[PDB]
Amino acid sequence: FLTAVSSIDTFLPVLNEAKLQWPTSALAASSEELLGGYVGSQFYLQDGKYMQFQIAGSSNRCELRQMIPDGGSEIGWAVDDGTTHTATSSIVVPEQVDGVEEVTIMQIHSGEAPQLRISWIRSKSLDGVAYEDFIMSTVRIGTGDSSDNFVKTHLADRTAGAMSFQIDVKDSKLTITVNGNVVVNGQDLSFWDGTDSCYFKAGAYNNNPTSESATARIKFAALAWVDHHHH
Numbered sequence: 344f345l346t347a348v349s350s351i352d353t354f355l356p357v358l359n360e361a362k363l364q365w366p367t368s369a370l371a372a373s374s375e376e377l378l379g380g381y382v383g384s385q386f387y388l389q390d391g392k393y394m395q396f397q398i399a400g401s402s403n404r405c406e407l408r409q410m411i412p413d414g415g416s417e418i419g420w421a422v423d424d425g426t427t428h429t430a431t432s433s434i435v436v437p438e439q440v441d442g443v444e445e446v447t448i449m450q451i452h453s454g455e456a457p458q459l460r461i462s463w464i465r466s467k468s469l470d471g472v473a474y475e476d477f478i479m480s481t482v483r484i485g486t487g488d489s490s491d492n493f494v495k496t497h498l499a500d501r502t503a504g505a506m507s508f509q510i511d512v513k514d515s516k517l518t519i520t521v522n523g524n525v526v527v528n529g530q531d532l533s534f535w536d537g538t539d540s541c542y543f544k545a546g547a548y549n550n551n552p553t554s555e556s557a558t559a560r561i562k563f564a565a566l567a568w569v570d571h572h573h574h
């Protein structure tokens with residue numbers, strides 16, 4: 344039988360501050376249900392160690408969505424609210440099967456748009472350089488679809504071992520640290536000033552696959568939302 348993520352101590356802090364959405368944005372498990380052993384092939388403990396997300400289908404997801412702790416409701420914060428908002432993770436991105444082209448593994452999202460997507464991507468040109476098998480950030484600086492609304496950055500080539508991420512938002516600015524190295528330093532997010540519905544996500548969100556049956560798979564060794572206020 345499949346082992347539940349909550350059978351070990353490692354992920355209990357974040358499971359106390361999340362709901363699981365799967366296979367769409369519909370609720371699959373509340374925080375309480377995650378803490379009490381919710382399990383399936385989309386969401387289980389691998390190697391006794393990794394919180395593993397699996398999902399097939401274009402635009403489908405298996406993702407944790409940040410919640411107020413202790414059974415609270417959806418959280419909502421702002422890039423300019425004066426608080427530092429922090430998420431950390433340690434992620435093993437395995438080699439993906441044929442048909443999977445891009446998997447979003449962390450997000451800053453609001454009521455209506457993704458401010459930040461960190462995604463694995465099989466192949467893409469950025470700024471006239473061709474890159475393969477890598478980790479990318481996509482930041483939105485507007486709501487339109489032309490290329491001027493996005494800032495896209497090569498963060499790192501995918502490694503076989505765990506890669507660590509820290510995301511910080513303070514005073515309308517975004518910083519992304521990858522394996523201890525600051526790669527994105529103070530990206531402007533002031534377009535989003537006043538939007539007070541932002542929240543973190545993490546897991547697997549499958550983008551533009553070429554087969555809807557191909558299963559994306561991501562393993563987390565650590566994940567936390569870091570409260571700079573200690574309630």
Ligand SMILES: O=C(O)[C@H]1O[C@@H](O[C@H]2[C@H](O)[C@H](O)[C@@H](O[C@H]3[C@H](O)[C@H](O)[C@H](O)O[C@@H]3C(=O)O)O[C@@H]2C(=O)O)[C@@H](O)[C@@H](O)[C@@H]1O
Pocket residue numbers: 450452455456457481483490493548550551
């Ligand atoms: O690859 C492209 O064709 C363009 O895709 C853009 O990123 C989009 C991404 O592929 C996802 O479709 C999607 O994720 C969010 C949606 O924006 C939407 O509001 C939905 O209701 O919530 C989704 C979520 O994040 O959970 O959104 C991306 C988007 O921002 O439109 C860009 O990478 C673009 O440059 C590219 O040409």
Ligand SMILES: O=C(O)C1=C[C@H](O)[C@H](O)[C@H](O[C@H]2[C@H](O)[C@H](O)[C@H](O)O[C@@H]2C(=O)O)O1
Pocket residue numbers: 364367368369370408417452
């Ligand atoms: O485009 C979406 O389907 C969508 C992307 C966001 O990341 C987020 O998952 C959002 O989810 C809402 C949704 O309305 C859902 O059905 C539920 O009632 O609340 C979600 C939420 O904000 O947590 O929709």
